[PDB]
Amino acid sequence: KVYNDGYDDDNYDYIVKNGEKWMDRYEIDSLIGKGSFGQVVKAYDRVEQEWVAIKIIKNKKAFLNQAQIEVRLLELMNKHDTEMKYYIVHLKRHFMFRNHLCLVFEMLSYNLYDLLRNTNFRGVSLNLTRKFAQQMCTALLFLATPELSIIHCDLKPENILLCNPKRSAIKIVDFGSSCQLGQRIYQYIQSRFYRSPEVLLGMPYDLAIDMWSLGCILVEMHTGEPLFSGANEVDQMNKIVEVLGIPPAHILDQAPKARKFFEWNLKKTREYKPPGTRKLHNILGVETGGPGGRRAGESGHTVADYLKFKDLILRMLDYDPKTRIQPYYALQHSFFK
Amino acid sequence: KVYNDGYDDDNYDYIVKNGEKWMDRYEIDSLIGKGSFGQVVKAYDRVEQEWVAIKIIKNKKAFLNQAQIEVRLLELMNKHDTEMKYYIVHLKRHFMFRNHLCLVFEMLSYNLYDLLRNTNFRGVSLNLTRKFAQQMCTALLFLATPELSIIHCDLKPENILLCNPKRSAIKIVDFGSSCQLGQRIYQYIQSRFYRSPEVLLGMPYDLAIDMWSLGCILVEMHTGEPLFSGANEVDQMNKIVEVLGIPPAHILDQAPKARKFFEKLPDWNLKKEYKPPGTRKLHNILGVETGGPGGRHTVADYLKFKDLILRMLDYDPKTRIQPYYALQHSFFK
Amino acid sequence: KVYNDGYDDDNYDYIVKNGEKWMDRYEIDSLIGKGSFGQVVKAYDRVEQEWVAIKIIKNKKAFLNQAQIEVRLLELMNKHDTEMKYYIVHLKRHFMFRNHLCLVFEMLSYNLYDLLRNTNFRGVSLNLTRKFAQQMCTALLFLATPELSIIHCDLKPENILLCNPKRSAIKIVDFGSSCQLGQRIYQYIQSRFYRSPEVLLGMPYDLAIDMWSLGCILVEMHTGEPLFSGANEVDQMNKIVEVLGIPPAHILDQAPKARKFFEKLPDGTWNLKKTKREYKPPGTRKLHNILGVETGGPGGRRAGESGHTVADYLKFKDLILRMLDYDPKTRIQPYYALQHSFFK
Amino acid sequence: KVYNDGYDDDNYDYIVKNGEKWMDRYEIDSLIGKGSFGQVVKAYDRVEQEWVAIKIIKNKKAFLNQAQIEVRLLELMNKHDTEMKYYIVHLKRHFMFRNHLCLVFEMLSYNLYDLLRNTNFRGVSLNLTRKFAQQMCTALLFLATPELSIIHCDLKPENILLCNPKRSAIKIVDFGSSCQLGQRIYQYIQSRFYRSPEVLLGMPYDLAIDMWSLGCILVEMHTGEPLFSGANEVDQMNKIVEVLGIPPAHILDQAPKARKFFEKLPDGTWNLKKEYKPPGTRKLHNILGVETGGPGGRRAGESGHTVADYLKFKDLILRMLDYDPKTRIQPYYALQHSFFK
Ligand SMILES: COc1cc(N2CCN(C)CC2)ccc1Nc1nccc(-c2cn(C)c3cnccc23)n1
Ligand SMILES: COc1cc(N2CCN(C)CC2)ccc1Nc1nccc(-c2cn(C)c3cnccc23)n1
Ligand SMILES: COc1cc(N2CCN(C)CC2)ccc1Nc1nccc(-c2cn(C)c3cnccc23)n1
Ligand SMILES: COc1cc(N2CCN(C)CC2)ccc1Nc1nccc(-c2cn(C)c3cnccc23)n1
C-alpha cells in the first residue's frame, strides 16, 4: 500500500513534486528525465544560487550499487588535472535524501536528441558536426587515459549534452552503464542503434566500442536520422551490412554469434538492400549537396569537406576493433585541420 | 516494439513460456514467483533427472551485478565443509541463457508464508515452532562464520522454504539482498514487519538484525500473525514499543533518527491509539499462562519460549542473543 | 648490482640522501623511521612552507598494494568534517616518485615509546595519562564512525605520536595494518603485548580489539612498563590471566585456540595448562595493586602529588577494567568511555 | 627476541625444518627456493601418496595479500575445463598453517636458468627451443582467454620450469606479480632483461608485454646468454636500440618517458640522447648465426638448423620483438608460424 513512508511509488522511484525543497536546499523545478536508474530533476540550489541537475536513484539495492560505481568513476576522473576532463559533465556532490542516493551535477541545456528534434531530424551543419566530433574524440581520449580506461558503453545522442544553446560546447553524461577495461562480463551492452559489431557477434570488446558509437552518432547529427535503425539484433546487423557490406572473414571466423547472422554470406530473415549498396557516400550526399541536397553551396560543405568527413566516419566504423581509429589518431585527422 | 530480439518484455524480464525447453536440458514447467530481481521458475533438468528452481535475472546491468554478488556469496558457502550449510538453499550452478543470468537451485516445496496460509493464519504448534527455530538458529550460526559474516537482510516467512510437506526441514532462500559485514552502505533494509530497531533508528548494524527478524518470525509462526505489522516506519516502531517499552536511553542518545519516533525530556518518551509502552506483553501474546495463542506444550515450555524470543528481541544489538548461545537455550533441550 | 637505476638498495628501499630536493618541492632532511613498508623521512615542503613526514613505500608490488589500502582509509577519513578527525595523523597528499609511492603526513614530534624512555620507564603522571586517555578515546570514537568502522589493529606506544614537544596533544599514526570491519581476513594481528584475548584465542573480532590495546597502553603510560609483557603467545595469555583471571567458559567453549592455553577438565571447567614459567594464581595480580591505588601510585612515586588521590586512582582503575573486559561485546565502547567519571 | 612463537625468523619467513610433518599430512623435505614472497619447499603428501611443492608465503600482511591475488588468478585458471591450462604449474590447494598462507603446487624438477647453466651458457638446440616455444605460446594463448586476460608480468628463465629431464614439458610458474587486463596500476614491472619497450617508455600495456619477454627468452635459450643485459633502464633501452634501431616516432611522440632515452630534433625526428654500437647495427642475424652454423658455429650441419630453419626463427623472434604492442605477434598467430611447421 505505502512505500518508503509514502515517498516512493511501487517502482522504488521517489514521487517527484514540484516546489519541494530537498534537504531544505534544492528547490525542485521539473523533471529532466526518467530511466531504469531513477529520475533526473531540474532544481535550484538555494545555497549556491544556481541551477543543478539532480539524479535521484531508485530506492533499491541493485540501483544504489550501480549508482555507487558511477560516483566512484566520476570522482576518479575528477582527480585528473587535464583540461580534457571538462568534456565530462561534472559531479558537484552527492547525498542521501529519504533513502535515495542523489547525484548533483552541473546543469546543461539539453541533449543532442533534443538538438536533432530542433532540426526536425534533418541534421545540423557539417561545421557544427566537426566541432562536436572534435570534442567527443577529446572526451574519448580522456576516458582512454590508462589509469582510467573507462568504457562509457551507452553513447547515444541522449547521453551527450549541449552546454548553452548559443554555443557548440558539449559534454558526455551518465556513466551508470560504464565500466573500466578490467570489469567486463556483460556482453549485451550499448544501445542497439549504436551497438558495435563485436558486441553483436560476442567478441572481446574494449574502449573501441565507444568509437563505433561515435561514428554512428556523428552521421546522425549531420543527416538528422539514425545511421543503423535496427529493430532487433539481426535487423541491426542487416542495416549495418547494407552500408558496410559483409564483415571480414577473419572476424566472422572467430565470431561466436556469426551464424546468428551469416552463413561468408548473409543469412535471410521487406527485403534488405544488398551488401554495401547503401553507400555512405550517398547517405552523406558527398557530391549531391549533403543530406537531402539541403547543404548545396553552404560554406564548409564542399566536396573536399565531405570526403574528409566520410573518411573519418569510415575509420570509426571499421569492422575490426583492433584497427578501428583510436582517439589520439582521430584528433589528428584532416577533417579537423 | 520488441526487446532482446523478442525474448524479453518491456521490463526486460524473460517472457516465461511454460513447456519451453532450454538447451535440450531444462523443461520449464511453471512460474514459482516474481520479484524485483526477475523470475523464479520450476523446471526439470533432463540431464541430471532432477527438479530445480531457476532464478532468471532481469536483462539489465544493475540486476546482473547484484545477482553476481549473490552468486559469489553462495559459492563462498559451498566451500565450507560443515553440515550447517545445508540449511541454506543450495545453488547447483549458474549459466547465461539468452542474455539472462540464471541461478539453478535445489527445488523445495513451498515457503513458510504458504504454510501460514495453510493453517488459515492460526499458526503451527510450539513443537513445530521449536524445530523451525533450531534449524534457523543453526543457519544463522553458519552465516556468522567469521570468514562469511553474511547478513541475509530480508529474513521473513516468504524467504524460508519447506523441504517436504510431510517433514519439518527448512532452508533459507534468496541472498539477493544479502551482504557481508562491512562499513555501512545501505540503511533502508529488511522487510518492514521484520525490520530491526537499529535499522529504524539509523544506527550501526550487523548480523544481529537477522536474529531480530527471526524472533518476529518465530512468534508469527506460532500465532499465525505478524508480531509488528507496521503500516509505515513510525507505525512500526510504535508497534514494537507496544510490546517492548521505550528503547533504552543510551540507545536513543546515539540514535540519529531517535526524534523521528521519540522526544528527549529535560530529565525519553514517545512522540505522537497505541497501547501504552510495554503493556502489549509477549506473555499474553503467546498465551503463556492461558494454554497458548487463543486457547490451544507446558507453561514451563511457553516460559522457555518467551525467554528465548525476548533475548532475540533485545533492543541492544550488542547484547541480543547470538546464534551459538541461542542453540544452548533451554527451549531446545 | 644496480636497483631502480641506482636509486634503490637491494631491498628496493629508496636510498635516502640528506639534502636531496624532490620535484623542486620537498627538501629531504633526515630519516624519521624505518619499517618493512619502507621508510619515513623528515622533509621541508617549500610550497606549503612547513615540515612534513614523507612515508616512502618500498618499490615492490606487495608493499605498494598495501600502502594503497592505507591511502584509501586515510582519504575515506579525510571526507569526514568532524573535529574528532584531528586525533589521526593527517594525510596531506600522495604521489609517485622514482617508482615509490610517497605519503605526505603532517610532521609530529616523537612517539609515546620515546616518552616512556624519557621517564626511564617510570611513567608519566595520572594527569597527563588522563589527557592521553580522553584523546585516544575520541580517536577510537572517530574510527567507529559507521561509514568508517576502521580497526587500527596495531595500537601501541610507537604508533601514538606527540604533536608538539610542549603540548599534550597526541594522535594515532600508521594505518598500514588497518582494516575496515568485515569478514575476517587476518588472524595474526596486533603487537603481542597489546594483543586482545579474542585474537589470541582465534575468535571473531571487531573494533573492540583497539580498546583492549588502549587499556594496556594507558596502564603502561602511567607505570612506565607494559602491563602484559608476553615473551610468546602462551606467556602473553598467562600474564593476562594473572591479572584478570580465567576467561569465561562460554568464550573458551568457542575459541578455536583455547587448547593452546587451557585444559577442559572432567568437571567441565577450564584451567590453564602447565608451562612446558611461574605465574601467580589466576586473578591474584590485581590491577588495584599494579596501579598502587592506595599506596602512592606506581612504586609509590606519586604519593602526595596533586591529582593522584585514592579517589582519582579508583576512577582510573574502573575505566581500565572496562577496557579489559574479556567479552568484546560488553567491553566499553569509546562513546561511553568518554562519559566515564575519570574524565568528569 | 622471538617471532611468531619462534616459528619465524626476523624476515617473517617460516623457519623450515627438514622432516617436519604438518597437520599429520604434509611431510616437509627440503627448501626448493626463496624469493621476496617467502619460500618454496618440496614435501610429501602422505594422505594422497604424492610429492608436492609448497609455496610458504611470508607471515606479513602485504605478502599475504599479494598471494591471495595469486590464489584468485590460479583458481580462475582451474575453472577452465581445457587442455591448455596444463602449461601452467597447477595449483592443487591452499591452506593456512602457523600464520602462513601455503600454496600446494604440483612439483617440477628445475628451471630454465638451470638448463642454461647445464649447457655452460651455450644454449640448447633449435629443435628443443622450438618445442619449448610452442608450449610457451600455448600457455600465452590460454592466458589470453577472454574471461582470463591474464598478464603474467614476470616471464623469465627462473619462472619457466622443466617438468623432468627426459620429458620435453615446460610450464610457467609464479603468478604473484600477475594481473588481469585492466586500468593501469603499476608501471615498474617485468624483470629488467625481459622488460618490454612500452613499459620502459611508460605507455599503456596489455598481454603483449609477455610476448616481448618470450622473444627475449627464446633467443637466450638458443644462445645461452641474455639478449638484452641492461645494467639499468637506460642501458636496457640502449641495448634494445643496438639490435632493433630507434623506435617508431609515433610511439615516441606519445611516450611519457621518451626523453629519458631519446632527444627530439628540431626537424621533428628522434635520436638517442648523450658508448654503444650505432642503432640497428647489432644484427640478430649475427647473434643467431643464421649463416655460420648457429651460435658459436656449433650447430653447423645439425638436423633442424638449416639456413631456412634459422630464417624462420629470426622472423618469428623479430615478430615477437615488434616495438609496437598493437602489431606484435599474438599467441594464436605465433602458433601458425612456419617455424613450427
Ligand atoms: C534543463 O536541463 C536538461 C534538459 C533536458 N531535456 C531532455 C528532455 N527534453 C524533452 C527537454 C530537455 C535534458 C538534460 C538537461 N540537463 C542536464 N544537465 C546535467 C545532467 C543531466 C542528466 C540527464 N540525464 C539523462 C542524466 C543521467 N545521469 C546523470 C545526469 C543526467 N541533464
Ligand atoms: C514449487 O516450489 C516452490 C513453490 C513456491 N510457491 C510460492 C508461492 N505460493 C503461492 C505457491 C508456492 C515457492 C518456492 C518454491 N520452490 C523453491 N525452491 C527453491 C528456490 C526457490 C526460490 C523462490 N524464490 C522467491 C527464490 C529467490 N531466489 C532464489 C531461489 C528462490 N523456491
Ligand atoms: C621527527 O619526527 C618524528 C620522530 C620520531 N622518532 C622516533 C624514534 N625516536 C628515537 C626519535 C623520535 C618518530 C616520529 C616522528 N614524526 C612523525 N610525524 C608524522 C608521521 C610519522 C611517522 C612515523 N612512522 C613510523 C610512520 C608510519 N606511517 C606513517 C607515518 C609515520 N612520524
Ligand atoms: C626441486 O624442484 C625445483 C628445484 C628448483 N631449483 C632451482 C635452483 N636450482 C639451482 C636447482 C633447482 C627450482 C624449482 C623446482 N620446483 C618447482 N616445482 C613446483 C613449483 C616450483 C616453484 C618455484 N618458484 C620460484 C615458485 C613460485 N611460485 C610458485 C611455485 C614455485 N618449483
Residue numbers in the entry:
A (entry chain D): 134 to 396, 403 to 408, 413 to 480
B (entry chain B): 134 to 400, 403 to 407, 414 to 437, 444 to 480
C (entry chain A): 134 to 409, 413 to 480
D (entry chain C): 134 to 407, 414 to 480
Question: What did the published study say regarding this structure?
Answer:
Aberrant activity of dual-specificity tyrosine phosphorylation-regulated kinases (DYRKs) has been linked to neurological disorders, diabetes, and cancer. DYRK1B and DYRK1A kinases share a sequence identity of 85% among the catalytic domain residues.
The DYRK1A in complex with AZ191 crystalized in the P2_1_2_1_2_1_ space group, and the asymmetric unit comprised 4 molecules. The crystals diffracted to 2.08 Å resolution. A well-defined electron density documents phosphorylation at the Tyr321 residue. Further, the methylpiperazine moiety contributes a water-mediated hydrogen bond with the main chain of Ile165 (an equivalent interaction is found with Ile117 in DYRK1B). However, the said water is found only in molecules A and C. Further, the inhibitor is stabilized by major hydrophobic interactions contributed by Ile165, Phe170, Val173, Phe238, Leu294, and Val306 (equivalent to Ile117, Phe122, Val125, Phe190, Leu246 and Val258 of DYRK1B, respectively). In the structure of DYRK1B, the sidechain of Leu192 is close to the methoxy group in the inhibitor, though it does not contribute to significant interactions. The equivalent residue in DYRK1A, Met240, has a slightly longer sidechain, which comes closer to the inhibitor. Overall, the calculations indicate that AZ191 captures more effectively DYRK1B by the hinge region, whereas in DYRK1A, the interactions with the hinge and the catalytic lysine are more balanced.
